[PDB]
Amino acid sequence: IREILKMGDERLLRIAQPVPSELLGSEELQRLIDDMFETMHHVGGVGLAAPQIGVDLQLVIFGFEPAVPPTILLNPRITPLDDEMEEGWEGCLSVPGLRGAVSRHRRIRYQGLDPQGQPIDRSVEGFHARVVQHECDHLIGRLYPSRITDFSKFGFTEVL
């Protein structure tokens, strides 16, 4: 169980380093992944990026039992499948107490590596697509407030 960094912390602004291929399949990468699951799960989040716990790596996890498969994604690359955008409510453990509506691509392809270096290549839409965009934003130093285009839909969760 690891401390989730909060918006304002300069570490969330980094462009994360790729996971080195030497670390694929290692116990250390395993431990990091397990800590991330334990951390995400303890605070009840749908996703977590390694930078939010202060680890400078292109690694994210996400899962929701609109269900989304439990996934561990390294060194990702996202490709929008079209121009259709869709607004949805988002929150984030690094921005506690808030929700905001954010416009994302409705459908994406994502690629990357699983923790053993096996290739991942999925096309997905709706919520799954949103989660993946949201978590990969952490790897380029972006939190969702920086993606809001309608500020009337940004506020405290209990107020909204």
Q: How far apart are CA 71 and CA 69, in angstroms?
A: 6
Asked if residue 16 binds Ni ion (CB under 5 A), the reply is: no
Least distance from Ni ion to the Cβ atom of residue 134, Å: 6
Q: How far apart are CA 147 and CA 132, in angstroms?
A: 14
Asked if residue 129 binds Ni ion (CB under 5 A), the reply is: no
Asked if residue 102 binds Ni ion (CB under 5 A), the reply is: no
The residue (of 20 and 25) whose beta carbon lies closer to Ni ion is: 20
Q: Which stretch binds Ni ion (CB under 5 A): 17-25, 26-34, 81-89, 114-122?
A: 17-25
Least distance from Ni ion to the Cβ atom of residue 145, Å: 11
Q: Which of 98, 103, 109 is nearest to 132 (CA)?
A: 109
Region of 7 on the Ramachandran plot (φ > 0 left; ψ -120 to 50 alpha; else beta): beta
CA distances from 109 to 34, 97, 105 (A): 26, 31, 10
Asked if residue 46 binds Ni ion (CB under 5 A), the reply is: no
The residue (of 50 and 92) whose beta carbon lies closer to Ni ion is: 92
Binders in 73-92 for Ni ion, by CB under 5 A? 92
Asked if residue 57 binds Ni ion (CB under 5 A), the reply is: no
Q: Where are the beta strands (DSSP E) in 28-67?
A: 47-49, 59-64
Asked if residue 68 binds Ni ion (CB under 5 A), the reply is: no
Clarify whether 135 is annotated catalytic. Answer: yes
Cα Dmax for the chain: 47
Catalytic hit among 28, 84, 135, 158:
135
3-class secondary-structure state, position 120: strand
Asked if residue 113 binds Ni ion (CB under 5 A), the reply is: no
Catalytic residue positions, numbered: 135
Site residues, Ni ion (CB under 5 A): 20, 92
